[PDB]
Amino acid sequence: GHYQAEAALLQCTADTLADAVLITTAHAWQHQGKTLFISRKTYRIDGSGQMAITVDVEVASDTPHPARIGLNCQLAQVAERVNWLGLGPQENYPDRLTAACFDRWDLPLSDMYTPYVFPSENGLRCGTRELNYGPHQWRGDFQFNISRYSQQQLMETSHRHLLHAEEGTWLNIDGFHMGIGGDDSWSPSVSAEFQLSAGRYHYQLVWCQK
Amino acid sequence: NGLVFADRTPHPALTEAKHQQQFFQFRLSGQTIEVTSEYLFRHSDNELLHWMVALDGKPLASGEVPLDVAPQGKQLIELPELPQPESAGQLWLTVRVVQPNATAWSEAGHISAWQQWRLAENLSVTLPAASHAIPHLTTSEMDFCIELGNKRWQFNRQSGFLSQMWIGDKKQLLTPLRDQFTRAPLDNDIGVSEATRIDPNAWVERWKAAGHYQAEAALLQCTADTLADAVLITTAHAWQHQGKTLFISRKTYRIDGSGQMAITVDVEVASDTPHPARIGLNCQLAQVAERVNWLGLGPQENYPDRLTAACFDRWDLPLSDMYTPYVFPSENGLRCGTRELNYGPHQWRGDFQFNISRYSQQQLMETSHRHLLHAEEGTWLNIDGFHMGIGGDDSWSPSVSAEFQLSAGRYHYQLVWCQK
Ligand code: NA
Ligand code: NA
Ligand code: NA
Incomplete structure (x- = not known):
């Protein structure tokens, strides 16, 4: 039920602090009575404009290990360049990143999409500490991909030429992302060390305007 | 040796x-346990398999099946339909091979083999009924204090640490709750290094040279905030040696109306400092209690690279059984994969490793023989989010495998401290 599980709100509170507003949330993703995931978050918005997002996820030990643990959203902005401090310049995944180098990379948005003839998840960059897109900056220690194509359109479309740019920009920021595998392509080939099997996961992000 | x-x-x-x-190997597929014999000559003619399913330590179902396996052969055992759990948590299957008859070398009832698997887990979604009580923050120049009934929490604003806790008029701490990044070095940490002939490559010497044992905590931040139903303390410390920042620890402490203190810890480890022996907290508790009760791996001492024999269950030992009397004293008695720990009035919950004893890490590292050790006042508690492997491939060169070294750079763990 991973693709169809719906978020159920458990808690959503706000507190005013000395120099910040704290939003605390908790969600459960359920499928036919079974709780697959729990997400607990705090968002701390301080007097300097920065929003600190803290995320703690629980994954049911008996559910198949998830493909990723992260956030996504469709940004209204369509910008020309993507600038990041992380691994690159090319697409890299946790079990395929040795060739990537850590540095300051700046590419046109189109290079952040890999035109695989059969469309899929693509264009991830790992080990990223800073991401810049238009007025937005995200900081932390994350994997990201960024394109005009939603994960939904990608999984519903069977040929790259049938893809259409969506309004704005789809951003996927992952704390964790499963390996891609490839020892073969007819049986699961992602190695145990690259499967998201730890049960509890923590990542944190700072979102601000630069 | x-x-x-x-x-x-x-x-x-x-x-x-x-x-x-072990001479029997196990695999689990659905309801089926597959038992494989590693005997070359004998049939399993003195063996029965005991199985038990428990929910976070509470027995749900158990049974016996006689083993009938040819040398190098296999046997399939179909578990019956299990009654579904009544509450949230993780179901565990434990199997044990038992010898019903005495032999020339063993007593009747001898356990020769065991194995555990996780079964269904049902995650807790139902929020605890919101307590009516609200804690109160008392702010002064030197301290943040939180009160709730007979309970009081004291945070020193000069040091940044929980320096004291009161249940009634009784102090609960002899030493402040502080981060700890070192261990009393094991024989494998020391190797062939000596005071008169330093081995610069040994773990203990890298730790010493980097200033791990002499590092001083510098307070970066200490703030207090009142929430609707809780008090929130935020701290940040930098551990430094000779102007070099080794570790940074950022914490929040959330105390609510139920008197539960939620501690969140986030640690940065400088990439060019030798990987630390542990990432945890420690304090000297005032209490000396007879028993230690825990839900986690046990019953015996187990470390991250030596815990396959330990089983997840509910264990209850006298305090002295939580100390291993190695003739040359070192870090000892750790239990890993622990979700709940009980000692006197205290309970800690989370996902941690711990040791608990009357000896500080300082005494263990300064004492060359076990008979020279003295019980200290109260009880020393080390609770680790992370602990380095012990190694042992040899004892004269570094032998802790890379996957058991604390090299991730950033670490997160979380604990709830409460009164039982
Ligand atoms: Na597709
Ligand atoms: Na038998
Ligand atoms: Na010693």
């Missing part, structure tokens, strides 16, 4: 050896 002490009392390592050298 023995698996047993000179008087033939076992070291903890002996049980790891016993488990790994």
Whole structure:
């Protein structure tokens, strides 16, 4: 039920602090009575404009290990360049990143999409500490991909030429992302060390305007 | 260098050896347990399999099946339909091979083999009924204090640490709750290094040279905030040696109306400092209690690279059984994969490793022989989010495998401290 599980709100509170507003949330993703995931978050918005997002996820030990643990959203902005401090310049995944180098990379948005003839998840960059897109900056220690194509359109479309740019920009920021595998392509080939099997996961992000 | 002490009392390592050298191998597929014999000549004619399913330590179902396996052969055992759990949590299957009859070498009832698997887990979604009580923050120049009934929490604003806790008029701490990144070095940490002939490559010497044992905590931040139903303390410390920042620890402490203190810890480890022996907290508790009760791996001492023999269950031992009397004293008695710990009035919950004893890490590292150790006032508690492997491939060069070194750079753990 991973693709169809719906978020159920458990808690959503706000507190005013000395120099910040704290939003605390908790969600459960359920499928036919079974709780697959729990997400607990705090968002701390301080007097300097920065929003600190803290995320703690629980994954049911008996559910198949998830493909990723992260956030996504469709940004209204369509910008020309993507600038990041992380691994690159090319697409890299946790079990395929040795060739990537850590540095300051700046590419046109189109290079952040890999035109695989059969469309899929693509264009991830790992080990990223800073991401810049238009007025937005995200900081932390994350994997990201960024394109005009939603994960939904990608999984519903069977040929790259049938893809259409969506309004704005789809951003996927992952704390964790499963390996891609490839020892073969007819049986699961992602190695145990690259499967998201730890049960509890923590990542944190700072979102601000630069 | 023995698996047993000179008087033939076992070291903890002996049980790891016993488990790994088992003559029966197990796989689980759905309801089916597959048992494989590693005997070459004998049939399993003195063996029965005991199985037990427990929910976070509470027995749900159990049974017996006689083993009937040819040498190098296999046997399939179909578990019956299990009654579904009544509450949230993780179901665990434990199997044990038992010898019903005495032999020339063993007593009737001898356990020769065991194995555990996680079964269904049902995650807790139902929020606890919101307590009516609200804690109160008392702010002064030197302290943040939180009160709730007979309970009081004191945070020193000069140091940044929980320096004291009161239940009634009784102090609960002899030493402030502080981060700890070192251990009393094991024989494997030391190797052939000596005061008169330093081995710069040994773990203990890298830790010493980097200033791990002499690092001083510098307070970066200490703030307090009142929420609707809780008090929130935020701290940040930098551990430094000779102007070099080794570790940074950022914490929040959330105390609510139920008197539960939620501690969140986030640690940065400088990439060019030798990987630390542990990432945890420690304090000297005022209480000395008779029993230690925990839900986690046990019953014996187990470390991250030596815990395959340990089983997840509910364990209850006298305090003295939580100290391993190695003739050369070192870090000892750790239990890993622990979700709940109980000692006197205290309970800690989370996902941690711990040791608990009357000896500080400082005394263990300064004392060369076990008979020279003295019980200190109260009880020393080390609770680790992370602990380095112990190694042992040899004892004269670094031998902790890369996957058991604390090299991730950033670490997160979380604990809830409450009164039982
Ligand atoms: Na597709
Ligand atoms: Na038998
Ligand atoms: Na010692």
